[PDB]
Amino acid sequence: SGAIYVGNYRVVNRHLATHNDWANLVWEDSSRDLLVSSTTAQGCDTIARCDCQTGVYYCSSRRKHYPVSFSKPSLIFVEASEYYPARYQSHLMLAVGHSEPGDCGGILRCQHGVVGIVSTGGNGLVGFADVRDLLWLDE
Ligand SMILES: COc1ccccc1CC(=O)N1CCC[C@H](C(N)=O)C1
Ligand SMILES: [Zn+2]
Numbered sequence: 590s591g592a593i594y595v596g597n598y599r600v601v602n603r604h605l606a607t608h609n610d611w612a613n614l615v616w617e618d619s620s621r622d623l624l625v626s627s628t629t630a631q632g633c634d635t636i637a638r639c640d641c642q643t644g645v646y647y648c649s650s651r652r653k654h655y656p657v658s659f660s661k662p663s664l665i666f667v668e669a670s671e672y673y674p675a676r677y678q679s680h681l682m683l684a685v686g687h688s689e690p691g692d693c694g695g696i697l698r699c700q701h702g703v704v705g706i707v708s709t710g711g712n713g714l715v716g717f718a719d720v721r722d723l724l725w726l727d728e
Contacts, residue, residue, distance in 0.1 A: 590605065593632075593636075593720065595703075596632060603621075604670065605694060613626040622678060622709075635701070636726050637721050639701045641699040641700070641701065643657065644704050646707060648695060650692050657684035657685070657686050657715070659682040660683050662719040667709055678709065678718075681717070682719055683714050683715070684715050687715070692710065693706070693707050704719065705717040706718050
């Protein structure tokens with residue numbers, strides 16, 4: 590599990606979104622595995638505006654923060670989930686690191702703040718749904 594709470598937005602994995610996220614849809618993208626819903630409260634997570642490629646991600650399945658080098662946002666193939674079929678996920682960033690299904694939502698952080706959230710893994714890899722392009726979260 591895990592979300593980002595910036596201003597009046599909740600950023601979650603689309604495949605872990607709730608009835609309340611959809612009741613309050615702002616933007617979803619199946620191909621990015623991203624959904625934003627509107628909150629009544631205010632949130633003060635800082636989104637990073639950078640092209641950093643090193644960072645720290647929370648790993649719920651080890652209860653640990655792990656430093657990673659990670660790739661540039663790209664299209665990468667993703668085996669048939671229970672949530673999606675076999676497809677190219679866009680805006681994905683891979684790193685060498687432990688992940689398992691429950692670890693989706695875990696935050697990737699860099700010196701300039703929240704980079705994105707765990708979204709994929711497999712074979713000692715871990716994939717991050719980038720959120721730095723989504724300038725509209727700021728304003
Ligand atoms: C944290 O991910 C894992 C790590 C190790 C093994 C399996 C998984 C699960 C996984 O990757 N997916 C299930 C949810 C939808 C995901 C997608 N973006 O389509 C694909
Ligand atoms: Zn950065």
